[PDB]
Amino acid sequence: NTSKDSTQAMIDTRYDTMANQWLQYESILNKLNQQLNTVTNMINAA
Amino acid sequence: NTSKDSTQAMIDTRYDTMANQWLQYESILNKLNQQLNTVTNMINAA
Amino acid sequence: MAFGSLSSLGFGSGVLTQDTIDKLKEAEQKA
Amino acid sequence: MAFGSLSSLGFGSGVLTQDTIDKLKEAEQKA
Amino acid sequence: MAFGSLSSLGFGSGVLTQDTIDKLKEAEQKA
Amino acid sequence: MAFGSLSSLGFGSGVLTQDTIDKLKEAEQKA
């Protein structure tokens, strides 16, 4: 049980950072989508 | 010509930042792809 | 793994249908 | 969820087949 | 025309590419 | 524009062919 729990910890250790990465690029693609909409707002405006 | 050049400046102004965003998410997706390969390297190793 | 890679990151790929609504309702009910 | 979105609203996507007719018949029978 | 109809209403169908960025830049330049 | 959005960011979508090689060669030649 002890060894299994150790490896279990290691398992979610990776995927937690991966979740952080997912939300990270969610924010980045929100920045780029909002900025594409921003240049599109300038395209429509300017 | 002057006014046209002003708006021309405004044009590339947006797309320069957009290029920065593109390389930005290139780096972020490189981080996530390398980290997916990292958790995959742990999956294969561990 | 030297080529282990993925192409994109996506969302919302598809079209709304009442069936999808029902699936979401079931998931919510469960959780 | 900031990007949680769907693209369209659709209907009738597809082609009629006797198999679909049979499925509808079964659904009606049930209900 | 009794069957003249369309299935859906859609947007954003696709993936961003620098090529699309260039096309948008050209369109803006024109207009 | 409230829905003006794109789904993904992608690369390398496709398969190599000698034709693509020729196209790249032409582009390089030009530039």
Author numbering:
A (entry chain I), B (entry chain C): 593 to 638
C (entry chain J), D (entry chain G), E (entry chain C), F (entry chain E): 1 to 31
Question: What do the authors report?
Answer:
In our cryo-EM map, FliD forms a pentameric architecture, consistent with the low-resolution cryo-EM structure of FliDse, with a similar overall architecture consisting of two pentamers in a head-to-tail arrangement. In addition, a significant subset of particles adopted top-view orientations, with clear 5-fold symmetry. This allowed us to obtain a structure of the full complex, to 4.7 Å resolution. A pentamer is about 170 Å in height (the decamer is ~300 Å) and 130 Å in width with a 20 Å lumen. We note however that the map shows a wide range of local resolution, with the leg domain well defined and with visible density for the large side-chains, while the head domain is more poorly defined. The FliDcj structure shows that the FliD protomer folds in on itself in a ν-shape, which results in N and C termini next to each other in the leg domain, as illustrated in the topology diagram. The overall architecture, as proposed previously, consists of a D0 domain formed by a long coiled coil, consisting of two helices located at the termini. A four-helix bundle forms the D1 domain. Connected to the D0–D1 leg domains are D2–D3 domains, rich in anti-parallel β-sheets, forming the head. In particular, we note that the D0 and D1 domains in the flagellin are largely structurally similar, and thus synonymous to the D0 and D1 domains in FliD. However, while it was predicted that the D0 domain consists of a two-helix coiled-coil, as present in the flagellin and hook, our structure reveals that the N-terminal 17 residues are extended into a stretch that folds under and behind the monomer, interacting with the preceding subunit via a short β-strand (see below). As a consequence, the C-terminal helix of the coiled-coil is not partnered with the N-terminus, but instead interacts with that of another molecule through hydrophobic interactions, forming the pentamer-to-pentamer interface.
The bacterial flagellum is a macromolecular motor that rotates and acts as a propeller in many bacteria. The filament, that can be >20 μm in length, is topped by a cap complex, that consists of several copies of the protein FliD. This complex initially attaches to the hook-filament junction, and using a yet unknown mechanism, assists in building the filament. In this study, we report the structure of the C. jejuni flagellar cap complex by cryo-EM.
